[PDB]
Amino acid sequence: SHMVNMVSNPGFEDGLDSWQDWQQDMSAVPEAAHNGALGLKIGGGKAAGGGQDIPLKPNTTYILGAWAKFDSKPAGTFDVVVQYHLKDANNTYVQHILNFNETDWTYKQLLFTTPDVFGSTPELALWKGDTSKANLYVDDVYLVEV
Ligand SMILES: OC[C@H]1O[C@@H](O[C@H]2[C@H](O)[C@@H](O)[C@H](O[C@H]3[C@H](O)[C@@H](O)[C@H](O[C@H]4[C@H](O)[C@@H](O)[C@H](O[C@H]5[C@H](O)[C@@H](O)[C@H](O)O[C@@H]5CO)O[C@@H]4CO)O[C@@H]3CO)O[C@@H]2CO)[C@H](O)[C@@H](O)[C@@H]1O
Numbered sequence: 149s150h151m152v153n154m155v156s157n158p159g160f161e162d163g164l165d166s167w168q169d170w171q172q173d174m175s176a177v178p179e180a181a182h183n184g185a186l187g188l189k190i191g192g193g194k195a196a197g198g199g200q201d202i203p204l205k206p207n208t209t210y211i212l213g214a215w216a217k218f219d220s221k222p223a224g225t226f227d228v229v230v231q232y233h234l235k236d237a238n239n240t241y242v243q244h245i246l247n248f249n250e251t252d253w254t255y256k257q258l259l260f261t262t263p264d265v266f267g268s269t270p271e272l273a274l275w276k277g278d279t280s281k282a283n284l285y286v287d288d289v290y291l292v293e294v
């Protein structure tokens with residue numbers, strides 16, 4: 149079966165379309181492509197990233213996945229995250245996190261199950277917290293209902 153990818157412009161083949169650019173250090177470039185013509189490059193030297201809002205169903209399991217690599221050895225990580233608050237008194241911030249520190253193309257995925265009620269709109273974050281000179285490439289991001 150072909151399962152719908154909920155991520156808009158998931159392979160950056162439409163450049164930066166549908167991705168919020170938080171630090172102005174994102175570019176869609178050939179060298180960052182694992183698939184197709186383009187991938188996302190997040191420039192090194194400081195923490196930077198981007199993301200998009202993706203409304204999710206309650207009490208539902210999702211696959212979150214991505215291909216990523218640093219072009220040189222990072223100090224920290226690049227993280228692919230689905231994050232949202234719970235509707236509780238503590239405003240609990242839930243994060244489903246894939247950590248990447250690899251210097252070769254690497255695919256990782258996780259599965260998570262959403263709560264009964266959301267406290268905020270789920271956000272898919274591509275967060276390169278690493279502050280080394282290493283550039284980060286990411287491509288073919290997936291968010292898929294099971
Ligand atoms: O800049 C203008 C622009 O801002 C937008 O808001 C952005 C903001 O710019 C970003 O800086 C911010 O980045 C945050 C990431 O979204 C979020 O995913 C990340 O969360 C961290 C978390 O802080 C950390 O504790 C966690 O550590 C885990 C480890 O990774 C695991 O290995 C370990 O096992 O467990 C720990 C604990 O769980 O990692 C996660 C993932 O890295 O924190 C970033 C901030 O430091 O995102 C904002 C959006 O949410 C704004 O939206 C725009 O409108 C505006 O133009």
Ligand SMILES: [Ca+2]
Pocket residue numbers: 159160161181182183184185186187287288
């Ligand atoms: Ca691509």
